[PDB]
Amino acid sequence: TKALISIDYTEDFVADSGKLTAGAPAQAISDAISKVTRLAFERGDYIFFTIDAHENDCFHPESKLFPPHNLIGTSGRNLYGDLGIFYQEHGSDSRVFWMDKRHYSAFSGTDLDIRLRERRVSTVILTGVLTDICVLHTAIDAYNLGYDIEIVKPAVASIWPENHQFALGHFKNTLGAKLVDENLNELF
Amino acid sequence: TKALISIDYTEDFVADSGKLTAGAPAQAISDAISKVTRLAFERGDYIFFTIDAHEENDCFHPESKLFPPHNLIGTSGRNLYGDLGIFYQEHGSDSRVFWMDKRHYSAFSGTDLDIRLRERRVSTVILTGVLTDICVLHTAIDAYNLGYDIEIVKPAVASIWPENHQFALGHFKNTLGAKLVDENLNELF
Amino acid sequence: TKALISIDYTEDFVADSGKLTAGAPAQAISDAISKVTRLAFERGDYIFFTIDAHEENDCFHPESKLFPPHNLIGTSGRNLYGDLGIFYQEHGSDSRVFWMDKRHYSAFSGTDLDIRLRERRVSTVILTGVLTDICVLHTAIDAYNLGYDIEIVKPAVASIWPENHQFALGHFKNTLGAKLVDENLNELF
Amino acid sequence: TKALISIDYTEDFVADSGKLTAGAPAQAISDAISKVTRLAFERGDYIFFTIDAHEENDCFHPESKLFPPHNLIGTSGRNLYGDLGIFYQEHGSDSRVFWMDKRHYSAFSGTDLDIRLRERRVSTVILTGVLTDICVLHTAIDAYNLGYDIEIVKPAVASIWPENHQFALGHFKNTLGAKLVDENLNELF
Ligand SMILES: [Zn+2]
Ligand SMILES: [Zn+2]
Ligand SMILES: [Zn+2]
Ligand SMILES: [Zn+2]
């Protein structure tokens, strides 16, 4: 049994009127990200929604770098597409988690590692946005914490195609990650 | 300039009808713990309420087998005891006052406490609450390993067992190099 | 998959002429600590010697104000005491045996212990060495927070203070959920 | 009070005959990386050499499947390249200069870097070395999560891939909020 991590696939990151939207490339993965999450859950895997929870926060260095996004209590934090429907169906399940984060990495200042260790999880499966920012930082932390890594290629996206390509190369060649499709089958 | 950490001073830990109550010794520090928290706030310090947030039937938590259900989410058992609860009603919305849910004994474990303290370049933590030999001890040890200067408010920490309370105070002073202070934040000799 | 951790059982902590010696109580566990280590090795367990590596004079270390110089790098005080030292000379080159320098009390703090254990998918640590209420206690608490199952070899841990040794053993069993075992690795009830 | 981090600038990563060499682009920064390190030292900064220390036949290390053997313990591959190596011969024994073995890409992973930095109350790290998109990138991300202000010496970092070098620099500035500086430690606009 593995764990699938769903990173920042919310209105503010995906929708056209989103505060920090990736636009077309992020919208394009909506079908794949929902399909792969449903499949992982059906298999018995743990699902962790790791979602930006921002505040107005003078002490956060990220405030100077990006405009306000994923603000607590706003509709910008709602999950985009059929993924949101999956959460409506199974959000209260013991195997499904909602986790607020303040840094890019899903591990930083959270209890993600603790929850995975409780369940003796050795492999993480990464999905969401952006490939070169919150997926990259999460993957690097996962590597340093000794997890096997899988990346769902058609269920990650970035605003810049060149940055998306760098990150995929980094996952495979530096982190030793397995690149998989929406059916959780290894790509060659 | 500094940060005060308020550890688990809730109804379940302090009140007579508390699910994991420390009883009389925990109740006896109510005046001192509220006094010292108000004083720290008045002089500009950051206040971190680090409170147990447990779920019953959490079979993956090793603590579930060691203690009865306590500080359950949505219950009155998580409410702060005494004038400390009044202080949170008054100033809990101030930018310098925080509420942090925790699952382990240590206030640092699986939380963003270290990140929040580093954002503010805090070098010294002041520890209060219960129990001296469990959630205060674990928090103090984590603080030591993370390079913080440590202050322990002696009249604002308590345990069920006098021998355990005394071990912990000895450990703080002689092994961690912590300063023991009174409810007026003055060094005890 | 289990790993035995051998904490600070060196000349400076054990021998009569040691710089920070626990003396007779530490000397008393020599037979049990060497026996349990050889047994763990025989059973295919990983063995980690986690040993204080201090410098005189380390200005920036908070420990320097609390204790006299001990376990100094390149000195005979860092030599393992008794048959445990003979074991290391025999099997130190084996891929399952490790020597790890540490600067804090905990074996995990600032080391790659957690990394090496995760590489091997170790779920249980077995703790031995000195002192029960300082470098063993700190290692145990870190192990707990990192999700490891814990075993404590009761006859292979020791302290200079008997009351502190008792607190620690109680803390291990009642707070950390650790298993207390003997030198044959059998659970004590 | 700042700390300069010198990452993997050794024979195996830089020299033409190095086992995992970045080649000409890495060799091209030799003048700048030595100059900036000597400058930092003169300004009273701390200097940390954080250097890969791998073992041959380390089957438990995930890196062993990804790259050929490199920076093996006790081999010439671990020797610092260029004037940096001369600087270390001159000032390695100074209390402000450190040598740290590492096994992961990041200088923080499984080391005591964070501990040594907090001991000195360092709030800003200055990064140099190779490769920009691997051990520099991982170190920078770790520094960011640990709340350090970050400076990157642009003419003193290098990669074998120019497009990857460009990505990393953009990532440092736009995502980590790092300051890009030259070999004179002056900000680049
Ligand atoms: Zn954000
Ligand atoms: Zn609890
Ligand atoms: Zn020591
Ligand atoms: Zn390497």
Q: Which residues contact D57 (CB under 8 A, 6 or more apart)?
A: none
Cβ neighbours of A171 (radius 10 Å): 25
Bridge partners for D57 per DSSP: none
Pairing of strands C124-130, C149-158: parallel
Task: Give yes or no for a contact between B130 and B7, defined as CB atoms under 8 angstroms apart.
Answer: yes
Which chain A residue's Cα is nearest to B96? A59
What experiment produced this structure? X-ray
Q: What is the torsional sign of CA D121, D127, D129, D135? A: positive
Residue with tokens 């953009």: D170
Total number of domains constituting chain D: 1
Peptide bond into C131 cis (omega under 30): yes
Task: Give yes or no for a contact between C157 and C29, defined as CB atoms under 8 angstroms apart.
Answer: yes
Structure tokens of B158? 């308590």
Residue with tokens 């600070």: C8
Residue with tokens 């636009």: A23
Residues of C in contact with B62 (CB under 8 A): 144, 177
Question: CB pairs below 8 Å between C and D: how many?
Answer: 30
Nearest CB among A103, A140, A163 relative to D138 is that of A140
Partner-chain contact A59 B120, CB within 8 Å: yes
- For residue D142, the SS3 value is helix
CATH number for the domain harbouring residue A86:
3.40.50.850
Task: Give yes or no for a contact between B114 and B144, defined as CB atoms under 8 angstroms apart.
Answer: no
Q: A69 to chain C nearest CA, in Å?
A: 33
What one-character DSSP code corresponds to residue B65?
G
Residue with tokens 């039937």: B57
Resolution of the entry in angstroms = 1.6
D6: exposed, middle or buried (Cβ count in 10 Å: 0-12, 13-18, 19+): buried
Pairing of strands B97-102, A178-180: unpaired
Task: Give yes or no for a contact between A11 and A18, defined as CB atoms under 8 angstroms apart.
Answer: yes
Nearest CB among C66, C105, C106 relative to B174 is that of C66
What one-character DSSP code corresponds to residue C171?
H
Q: How far is the CA of A95 from the centre of ligand 2 (A)?
A: 22
Task: Give yes or no for a contact between C5 and C107, defined as CB atoms under 8 angstroms apart.
Answer: yes
The DSSP result for C121-159, as a single string, is: T--EEEEEEE-IIIIIHHHHHHHHHTT-EEEEEEEEEE-
- How far is Cα of residue B5 from the mean position of the Cα atoms in its chain? 5
Which residue from D171, D63, D73, D74 is spatially nearest to D127, judged by alpha carbons?
D171
Pairing of strands C97-102, C46-52: parallel
Which chain D residue's Cα is nearest to C114? D110
Q: How far is the CA of C75 from the centre of ligand 1 (A)?
A: 51
User: Residue A164 and residue D104: Cα distance in Å, rounded?
Assistant: 24
Residue in C112, C114, C118, C121 to test binding to D, most D beta-carbons within 10 Å: C112
Which residue from A94, A106, A110, A79 is spatially nearest to A1, judged by alpha carbons?
A94
Question: CB pairs below 8 Å between A and D: how many?
Answer: 46
Nearest CB among D110, D114, D116 relative to C115 is that of D110
Nearest CB among B62, B105, B145 relative to C109 is that of B145
| Residue A6, H or E segment | strand A3-7
What is the residue type of B14?
V
Alpha helices by DSSP H, listed for A74-181, are: 82-90, 112-118, 134-144, 161-173
- How far is Cα of residue A118 from the mean position of the Cα atoms in its chain? 21
User: Residue A124 and residue B98: Cα distance in Å, rounded?
Assistant: 32
User: Residue A85 and residue A36: Cα distance in Å, rounded?
Assistant: 14
Q: B115 to chain A nearest CA, in Å?
A: 7
* Domain extent at residue B159: 1-189
For D188, half-sphere exposure in the C-beta direction (CA atoms, 13 angstrom radius) is 14
Question: Which strands, in side-by-side order, build the sheet including B97-102?
Answer: B97-102, B46-52, B3-7, B124-130, B149-158, B179-181
Which chain C residue's Cα is nearest to A147? C118
Structure tokens of B23? 């009883």
- For residue C45, the SS3 value is coil
Residue with tokens 């990495």: A105
- For residue D48, the SS3 value is strand
- Locate the DSSP E strands across C37-121: 46-52, 97-102
Q: Which residues contact D69 (CB under 8 A, 6 or more apart)?
A: D19, D54, D56
User: Residue C123 and residue B65: Cα distance in Å, rounded?
Assistant: 18
| Residue B102, H or E segment | strand B97-102
Q: How far is the CA of A89 from the centre of ligand 1 (A)?
A: 27
Which residue from D77, D103, D163, B75 is spatially nearest to C119, judged by alpha carbons?
D103
User: Residue C125 and residue C150: Cα distance in Å, rounded?
Assistant: 5
Which chain D residue's Cα is nearest to B146? D115
Q: How far is the CA of C115 from the centre of ligand 2 (A)?
A: 28
- Say which ligand is closest to the CA of C10: 3
